[PDB]
Amino acid sequence: NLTRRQQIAIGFVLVLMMLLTRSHHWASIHSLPDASWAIFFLLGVYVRALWVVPALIAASVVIDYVAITWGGVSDFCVSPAYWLLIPAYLALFAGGRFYARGHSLSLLGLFRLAGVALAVVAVAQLLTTGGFYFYSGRFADPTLAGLVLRLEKYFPPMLGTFALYVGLAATVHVALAAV
Numbered sequence: 387n388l389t390r391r392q393q394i395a396i397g398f399v400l401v402l403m404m405l406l407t408r409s410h411h412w413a414s415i416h417s418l419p420d421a422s423w424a425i426f427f428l429l430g431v432y433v434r435a436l437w438v439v440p441a442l443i444a445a446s447v448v449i450d451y452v453a454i455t456w457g458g459v460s461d462f463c464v465s466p467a468y469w470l471l472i473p474a475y476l477a478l479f480a481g482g483r484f485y486a487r488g489h490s491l492s493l494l495g496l497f498r499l500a501g502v503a504l505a506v507v508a509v510a511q512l513l514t515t516g517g518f519y520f521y522s523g524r525f526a527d528p529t530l531a532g533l534v535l536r537l538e539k540y541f542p543p544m545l546g547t548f549a550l551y552v553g554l555a556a557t558v559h560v561a562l563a564a565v
C-alpha cells in the first residue's frame with residue numbers, strides 16, 4: 387500500500403520518461419527510445435486503478451503537441467491516423483492484464499511473457515504502422531504488400547524497445563523480491 391506521496395513520485399517518473407523518450411521510436415546514441423508502449427503493458431501487469439490509463443493517454447497527447455509545436459519535432463507522424471494510437475495503448479494495457487492472470491514468475495513464466503509480448507506488440511504494430519500507412523494520407527497508393535514491408539521494417543526494432551523496458555522492469559522486480 388503506497389502512500390499518496392510515493393504514488394505521485396511514480397506518476398511523475400512515468401510522465402517524465404514519456405516526456406524524454408516520446409520523440410524517438412528507437413534508441414539513438416544520444417537518446418532513449420519511446421517508453422510509452424512498455425509503460426502501458428506494465429500498467430496492465432501492475433496497476434488496478436483504471437483511471438491511470440486514460441490519464442496517461444492525456445499526457446501522451448499533450449507531450450506530443452508541445453514537442454511538435456514548441457520542441458521542434460517533425461509533424462510528419464501527426465495525421466488523421468494519429469488517434470489509432472489509443473486502441474494501440476489499450477491493446478498493450480490488456481496484454482499486460484492478460485500476462486498477469488497466469489504469471490507463476492517461473493522460467494516458463496518468462497516463456498509465457500515472450501509470447502504475450504510478441505502478440506500485443508504485433509497488434510499495436512498493426513494499428514499504428516498499418517493505421518498510419520492507410521489513413522494518414524502520407525502514402526499515395528497503400529497496398530497490403532507495402533503494409534507487410536512496413537511491418538517487417540518497424541515491428542522488430544519497436545519490439546526491441548519494448549523488450550528492453552519490460553525486461554528492465556523484470557530485472558527491477560527481482561531487486562524487490564530480494565529486499
Ligand code: B12
Nearest residue numbers: 408409410411450453459460462463467468470514515518
Ligand atoms: C521517422 C519517424 C519519426 C521521427 C520524425 C519523423 C521524420 N520524418 O523525421 C521521430 C523519431 C521524430 C518520430 C516521432 C513521433 N512519432 Co513517428 N515515426 C517515424 C517512422 C519510423 C517513419 C515514418 C515514415 O513513415 N517514414 C517516411 C516514409 C515515407 O518512409 P518509409 O516509406 O518507411 O521509407 C521510405 C524512405 O526510406 C525512402 N528511401 C529510402 N532511402 C532513401 C534515401 C533518401 C535520401 C530518400 C529521399 C528516400 C529514401 O524509400 C522508402 C519507401 O519504401 C514511423 C514508423 C512506422 N511507419 O510505423 C513512425 C510513426 C509514423 N510515428 C508515429 C508517432 C505517433 C509519433 C509521435 C507523434 C508520438 C510517438 N512517439 O508515438 C512522435 C512525435 C511527437 C513527439 N516527439 O512527442 C506513429 C503514427 C501512429 C498513427 N496512428 O498515426 C508511427 C506509425 C509509429 C508507431 N507508433 O508505430 N517519428
